[PDB]
Amino acid sequence: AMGSMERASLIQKAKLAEQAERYEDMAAFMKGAVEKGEELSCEERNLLSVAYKNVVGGQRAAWRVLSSIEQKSGPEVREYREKVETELQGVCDTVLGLLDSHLIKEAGDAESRVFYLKMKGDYYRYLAEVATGDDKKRIIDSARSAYQEAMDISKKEMPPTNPIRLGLALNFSVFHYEIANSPEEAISLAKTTFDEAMADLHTLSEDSYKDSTLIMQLLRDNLTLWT
């Protein structure tokens, strides 16, 4: 639908849609921007992630409410849970398709490549939340593979306080705890990530320190929930 709109106009409209809390419109604008075929700047990668995370967030919350009602229990609750689930899978497939065509292959700098591989892990993780049986096993391994590739690049190329490296580690730990039935791996990764970041905070400016400590606090909040 966005092929006739200028790239810069799509980006400006994405920012307006964000201000208006119109996240579906924000995601359509950012999909159109990606489909222009150019690489995304830092700010543009943030807009893409904000848009899709808010869309799939509403779907994830609705699916949890419907699955709870269905578990408590005619065909209508299952049919409607299935409708929401299919829409959620379609959003995840759309994001994964943008990453595969062609954001990841063109991302050479660590900050872009790690961010996109983290996103790949995250959207396979959202697919895994609603998957059953053998479908779930393959989707879990796809998430795990993307997170591991991102982790290996982040540990080689980024300091331990880097917010992207922290946010990756924080989501990989969620994957281990919530998806992979590996709570011990989740706790170990959160603890090591936290402690290595703590030891590198002395290198940061006031503003960088605030960026890093905000993600570190999420690691600590999870360790408090998990232990």
């Binding site: 992207i164 946010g167 969620v174 960026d211 993600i215």
Partner: peptide, 13 residues
């Protein structure tokens, strides 16, 4: 129940 990352990981570049 677990907390995952915000969509934006830091304020700037």
């Amino acid at each position: 129940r677990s907390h995952s990352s915000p969509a934006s990981l830091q304020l700037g570049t």
